[PDB]
Paper text:
One example of an HNL with an α/β-hydrolase fold is the hydroxynitrile lyase from the Pará rubber tree Hevea brasiliensis (HbHNL).
Six of the seven substitutions replace residues in and around the active site with a corresponding residue from SABP2 (Thr11Gly, Glu79His, Cys81Leu, Asn104Ala, Gly176Ser and Lys236Met). The seventh substitution, His103Val, introduces an amino acid similar to the leucine in SABP2. The harvested crystal belonged to space group C2221, with unit-cell parameters a = 47.05, b = 106.38, c = 128.40 Å and one molecule per asymmetric unit. As this electron density near the catalytic serine Oγ remains unmodeled, this model should be considered a putative structure. Although HNL6V contains the Cys81Leu substitution, the side chain of the leucine still points in the same direction as the cysteine in HbHNL.
Residue numbers in the entry: 3 to 257
The structure:
């Protein structure tokens, strides 16, 4: 059996995994679904957070708490692929594999903002998404709150109204920390570069467009690619059984 650690994307929280966690547990696995900083029911506000690395603190702290010899399979969604890379550069030995589900896939050859800048060229219009600025640690940071119409049409395209309602209800303001990411030291070959990486995507994704998702595969070759037919960007909501099937096959492959 495996221990999966489920990692949401920006403006989201552990709650996006509410369908997938019971299914993985019904297969016998251990599952942790974290709220990152200022996300979900985390007490902090985004304006206290000055970088992706501080944003990732609950994942780093969880991994620090793993006793020696315990390995986990990280599963990230959307921007959560970046939290994976940060965690991997400190605790690569605790990571049996990383699975990127409709997610960004950073590399080691370019700066940590690389795949995010590519994402805004491929998808530059975020519809009713609002933006704001705050200063933390001397740097001006642009925060955002995903627009409800963007959520409806581009992320939750195929989700029922009861799932979409949770998003209107629970998504919170966040930030891409895009300028901070550009100046951060590169992810390292020895840490992040060394972990097994499995890339899960759908060409029906209406925000992480096929051009982007395919460019990422070409830019940084995963150890395994699964293409999910159908669904939408919220693959753990619209294709939950398929994702649990893929995760069982990763566990069977990577301990």
């Amino acid at each position: 059996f495996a221990h999966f650690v489920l990692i949401h994307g920006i403006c989201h929280g552990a709650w996006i995994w509410h369908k997938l966690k019971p299914l993985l547990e019904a297969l016998g696995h251990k599952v942790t679904a974290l709220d990152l900083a200022a996300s979900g029911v985390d007490p902090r506000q985004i304006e206290e957070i000055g970088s992706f690395d501080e944003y990732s603190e609950p994942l780093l702290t969880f991994l620090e708490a793993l006793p020696p010899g315990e390995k986990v399979i990280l599963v990230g969604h959307s921007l959560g692929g970046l939290n994976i890379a940060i965690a991997a550069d400190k605790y690569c030995e605790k990571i049996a594999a990383a699975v990127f589900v409709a997610s960004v896939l950073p590399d080691t050859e370019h700066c940590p903002s690389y795949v995010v800048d590519k994402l805004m060229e491929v998808f530059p219009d975020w519809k009713d998404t609002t933006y704001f600025t705050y200063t933390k640690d001397g740097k001006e940071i642009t925060g955002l709150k995903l627009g409800f119409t963007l959520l409806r049409e581009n992320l939750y395209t195929l989700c029922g109204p009861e799932e979409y309602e949770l998003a209107k209800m629970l998504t919170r303001k966040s930030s891409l920390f895009q300028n901070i990411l550009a100046k951060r030291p590169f992810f390292t070959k020895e840490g992040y570069g060394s972990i097994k990486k499995i890339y899960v995507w759908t060409d029906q994704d209406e925000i992480f467009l096929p051009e982007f998702q395919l460019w990422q595969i070409e830019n940084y070759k995963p150890d395994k690619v699964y293409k999910v037919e159908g669904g939408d960007h919220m693959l753990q909501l619209t294709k939950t059984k398929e994702i649990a099937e893929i995760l069982q096959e990763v566990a069977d492959t990577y301990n």
